[PDB]
Design a protein around this ligand. Structure first.
Ligand SMILES: Nc1c2c(nc3ccccc13)CCCC2
Ligand SMILES: Nc1c2c(nc3ccccc13)CCCC2
Lengths: 528, 528
């Protein structure tokens, strides 16, 4: 055996993959649900019928349908994130990298990919778990889940297209892992789900959803938080967008049945083509088809849940990157461009903030500008570029995350917080973008170990520390082997910097700005 | 003669006063209007009937009735500001210090005292013009004007008690100066009115009032601005307070006639006793009987006037002191005390801001706290003490002054701005109060020249510079004799520090904070 495994669904043949100077076993493309094609589009996933024979798990699966990014065709910095396999609706599979020799029972790390809920692949090279599995000796798996319309369309009172289906796909994979990781050497009672962006937000959504709390132990959230403004919509909104999509394809909108049948006949690409049209406003960092607060997956509003402790209580490890805004600005705010150093004028500055705070009213926008502008240097293009980069970041990633942390820490069983602020020496994006959203993942997956990728030795050191913290936290529940990375406490809110220097512990990650967003802004907008 | 002068009202005999190593002539107590006693209380001042004989002008006049401050009885720091002569309703007189030998025609400086409109005397030792008159060879005069109820009660549609009467008294003295300073060697076409606190606000009110624009050339405003929130009330409000006072003395409130007669029978002290009761709210830095925007003295709201250029266009010299709040906090905010270093708790901090912003709503207060609190050190007593000291100062003196400057500069003929931030070495108030409101006046009047007062030599130097700037500006219109004290421009808003070091020019005095008060706060409060 070694490469032959009997799972409760059938047998699977993997491959021996080279890792550094050795090998590992890899089982790629194991199906975990029935292909949600045909009349199953938009419906919740079915558990997969067992198979006879041996499933060949030697190649990656297809990727789900999604919007291909071709804003900088050929550019590696963007291309590295695009589906590198044939897209297909039939894309619910999972991959597992297992050590050699196969362990008896060891920790498991399940990776849930990001992509703003409209994109993502498990087959990307920055998600190749061979290095982590090998260096830390853990079993690592990667899920697949429907993104976009296909995974989050939500005609609420319908069985044909209830929302959150992509969320259910995640769960189903979590189930299969629970019920079969043992045959691969993993301990089902010690699986940690980790994810970034929408993945990190999904993770926190599993910590909240009653139905998923039991299929995992601990969780890691990277630049994501379930309460982030771009991660959920009400049923009403989902309906709104669902129908709006329908009219863009000129579907009969007299009933959900008609609407849905119609959408089920359209070719996948047609859906993607008009997907970005249904948003209700001009905005940046906002996605169309996202999780809906439907009353099932989430019993109540996430805010009540956070306030009542209605969530799984384990320990979590989470964090943020220094320049979370960059990517969003560069891709859709006027004035930024990849080959320029993007100095923004006050005109484009004000245009930017409108895009970042789509729900603010005049007074709100005014309030934001007040805080983010250096009044004694009002028209400085560099300062304006940077201020915008912090508006997007604080509003959309840092401040909601800090909110989550504070409400979770009251009842969780430990919290570790990091601030990743290192720019890879080989970054191909411009220096103005800084430490970009998505850029710590190279570290967590150990790509610096690959000398051919040109990282400095000091960075190799850094990913090994990161990988260890991640692994040790997954096993133990504390990232430190027996300097200490302090626990985060509501009292003395400590966190650490995660860069190549001697570690520094700091306190109160972005308080000043975060009280503005978490307490002032909302009141303002409500009073008005 | 020398000491005998014929004025258009009658002859006056002065005194030769020692000044340093020499002498000067001083004419103290020259009447300028008919004593507003009896049935004239509350009424506008009459020009004084000429007299026969020689008026003996050898002693100071009586002081107007006012509230004596006895919060720290015997303490010089407070006592220095209390009436040092018998108070009387008969107090409209003026004083003039003239050089020896009498000049032919020279610049004139008329001092209008401060006191929040409820107090003030011209006879105080820090307003003794012998040093200025001598060192700079100018004619210096000091007015007297009714303060409190007696000078600002305002039953609008009444001839018996129209408002702004104290303001008219100032004018009348300005008239007499215009019509007779020549007999003392002064040039009526080169009189500069200077004043501090309410005096500085009065000065700006003369620059605005059509009726006074012609009796003076230039103006100096120290820690005051006509648009400061505590300097004026609407006719409605004045009526309100006028009647409220009436009920505290149980006057018949069926008519202005009854009310007024009643108030005219009360002894002066009764009025003072309940004077502070009529305010509409708990507050700090707010006075009861103040100028009313009546449509006569001020044709329109001061804001329209500022916006339309409806004001005298000459050059002005104005400024602020570093710690304008101190005195107000110390006198009526909970937690501050003279012999303690007043570390304020967040409780008293929040109590303080409520007192400083009596018109803010919850959201407004919230907005202030946001800006003035150091969120990463929330409970620091020192930081809270200081923050409050800046709330009061920025809200009540610095920010309105900067507003005035900006609107005036568009149409004035030159503007010079200073930031006085030197703490006298012999200050008897605690170090936490810093550079207190009122404390530059010692400098402007040259008391450091008096060696018996114990100032350092470096301070002697400082008052001579100050006195020169003040004198030279009064003559020329520019404080610099032919480093330069730049003009203030709306473009590059320069100002200078006025302390014993090498002069520094800075830009944009308190922009950040001032945009909050001048533009944000008001909108907020209006939207809500
Ligand atoms: N497509 C991208 C994704 C991420 N970052 C990116 C950064 C730049 C350009 C494209 C990106 C973060 C994870 C999700 C996908
Ligand atoms: N009574 C006072 C006045 C001023 N400052 C003071 C400062 C401390 C205590 C009393 C004061 C400034 C000018 C007006 C009067």
């Amino acid at each position: 055996s070694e490469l032959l495994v009997n799972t409760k669904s059938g047998k699977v043949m993997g491959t021996r993959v080279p890792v550094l100077s050795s090998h590992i076993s890899a089982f790629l493309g194991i199906p975990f649900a029935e292909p949600p094609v045909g009349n199953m589009r938009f419906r919740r996933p079915e558990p997969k019928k067992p198979w006879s024979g041996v499933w060949n798990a030697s190649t990656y699966p297809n990727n789900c349908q999604q919007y291909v990014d071709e804003q900088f065709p050929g550019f590696s910095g963007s291309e590295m994130w695009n589906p590198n396999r044939e897209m297909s609706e039939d894309c619910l599979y999972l991959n597992i990298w297992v050590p050699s020799p196969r362990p008896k029972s060891t920790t498991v790390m399940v990776w849930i990919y990001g992509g703003g809920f409209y994109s993502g692949s498990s087959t990307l090279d920055v998600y190749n778990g061979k290095y982590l599995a090998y260096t830390e000796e853990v079993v690592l798996v990667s899920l697949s889940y429907r993104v976009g319309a296909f995974g989050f369309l939500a005609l609420h009172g319908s069985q044909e297209a209830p929302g959150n289906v992509g969320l259910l796909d995640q769960r189903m994979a979590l189930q299969w892992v629970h019920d079969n990781i043992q045959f691969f050497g993993g301990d089902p009672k010690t699986v940690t789900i980790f994810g970034e962006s929408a993945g990190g937000a999904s993770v926190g959504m599993h910590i909240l959803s009653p139905g998923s709390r039991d299929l995992f132990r601990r969780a890691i959230l990277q630049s994501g938080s379930p309460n982030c403004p771009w991660a959920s919509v009400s049923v009403a909104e989902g309906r709104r967008r669902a129908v709006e999509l329908g009219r863009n394809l000129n579907c009969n909108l007299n009933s959900d049945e008609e609407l849905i049948h119609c959408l089920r006949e359209k070719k996948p690409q047609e859906l993607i083509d008009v997907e970005w049209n249904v948003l209700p406003f001009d905005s940046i960092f906002r996605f169309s088809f996202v999780p809906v607060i439907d009353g099932e997956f989430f019993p109540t509003s996430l805010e009540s849940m956070l306030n009542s402790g209605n969530f799984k209580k384990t320990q979590i490890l989470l964090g943020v990157n220094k320049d979370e805004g960059s990517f969003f600005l560069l891709y859709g705010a006027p004035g930024f461009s990849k080959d320029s150093e993007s100095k923004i004028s006050r005109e484009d500055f004000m245009s930017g903030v409108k895009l970042s705070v789509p729900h603010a009213n005049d007074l709100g926008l005014d309030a934001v500008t007040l805080q983010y502008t250096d009044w004694m240097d009002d028209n400085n293009g560099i300062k304006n570029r940077d201020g915008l980069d912090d508006i997007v970041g604080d509003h959309n990633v840092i401040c909601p995350l800090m909110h989550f942390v504070n409400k979770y820490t009251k009842f969780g069983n430990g919290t570790y917080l990091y601030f990743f602020n290192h720019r890879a020496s080989n970054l191909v994006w411009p220096e103005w973008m800084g430490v970009i959203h998505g850029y710590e993942i190279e570290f967590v997956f150990g790509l610096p170990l690959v000398k051919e990728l040109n990282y400095t030795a000091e960075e190799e050191a850094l990913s090994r520390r990161i990988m260890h913290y991640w692994a040790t936290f997954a096993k133990t529940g504390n990232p430190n082997e027996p300097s200490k990375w302090p626990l985060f406490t509501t009292k003395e809110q400590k966190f650490i910097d995660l860069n190549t220097e001697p570690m520094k512990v700091h306190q109160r990650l972005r308080v000043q700005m975060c009280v503005f967003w978490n307490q002032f802004l909302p009141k303002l907008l409500n009073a008005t």
